[PDB]
Amino acid sequence: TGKGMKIVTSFYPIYAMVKEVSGDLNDVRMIQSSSGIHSFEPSANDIAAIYDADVFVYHSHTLESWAGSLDPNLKKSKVKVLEASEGMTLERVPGTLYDPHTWLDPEKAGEEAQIIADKLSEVDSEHKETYQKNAQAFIKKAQELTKKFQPKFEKATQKTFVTQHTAFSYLAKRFGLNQLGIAGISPEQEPSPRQLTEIQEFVKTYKVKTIFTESNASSKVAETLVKSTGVGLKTLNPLESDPQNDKTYLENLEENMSILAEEL
Ligand code: NA
Ligand code: NA
Ligand SMILES: [Zn+2]
């Protein structure tokens, strides 16, 4: 063919992971309206752009809540709608609600790459070879990232970190670390400020030096935490936006894995 399969994609970890699985094969574009995956709701335009694509790929029913309820066979469409984490077992929001933030655990990015290739290679049978090997490398350089880093986080310099929202729960757990998010699983679940007072002392108790913000401006509520008791601000990417740059997906995961481990 002289085109490829037109493929729409919810947000970055998906963008990057379909693109890595496809290599040079398909027309992979991202819903790229822009805003923030947790609170984002597709315009009539994006909806029509989905129904217009050959393939649409999202992360999970627990994140992109519109997606279930996309109705191609009714709205006269022929999209393959693909939930890339389908089957993947998600941890419950602690103590109904589940943490979607898989992609940040190198192993789990790996498993999601696979699912992608599988579903892609049933939909576009010819290119099964290209998908399964692109994914295969991916999972391989992911298992290697886990290996490079397991010792880093072993040597500790103690455990705990605090991030702008609750995104690193899966990373942290794969590495013996424990995290605290200023916000809940989504950035719009902001503290209280009774919660703010607790997290304030958590910084003290567990003796934490850097609060990790994002660019993604909407945490003054973090800024104002150096700007209270304690000190120290550094930015840590949950990969919900794309940084663009050139870097691969795993290259960006690794880069923020640097930052976090270097902080010890
Ligand atoms: Na479908
Ligand atoms: Na092929
Ligand atoms: Zn998030």
Description:
- β8, α7 and β9 form a beta-alpha-beta unit.
- The protein is of the alpha/beta class.
- The protein has a four-stranded parallel β-sheet with strand order 2-1-3-5, sandwiched between helices.
- The protein is globular and about 60 Å long.
- The longest helix has 27 residues.
- It has eight helices and nine strands.
- α1 crosses α4, α3 runs antiparallel to α4 and α4 packs parallel to α8.
- It folds into two domains: 156 residues, Rossmann fold (3-Layer(aba) Sandwich); 108 residues, Nitrogenase molybdenum iron protein domain (Rossmann fold).
- Helix content is 39%, strand content 14%.
- 36% of the residues are buried.
- It binds sodium ion (2 copies) and zinc ion.
- The PDB classes it as metal binding protein.
- Keywords: zinc-binding, Transport, lipid binding protein, metal binding protein.
Layout: helices, strands, pairs:
Layout: E1 6-9, H1 12-22, E2 27-30, H2 44-52, E3 55-58, E4 66-70, E5 80-83, H3 106-123, H4 128-154, E6 161-165, H5 169-174, E7 179-183, H6 194-205, E8 211-213, H7 220-226, E9 233-235, H8 249-262
Parallel strand pairs: 1-2, 1-3, 3-5, 6-7, 6-8, 8-9
The protein binds sodium ion (2 copies) and zinc ion.
Residues 127, 129-130 line the site of one sodium ion.
Organism: Streptococcus pneumoniae (strain ATCC BAA-255 / R6)
Protein name: Lipoprotein
Family: Belongs to the bacterial solute-binding protein 9 family.
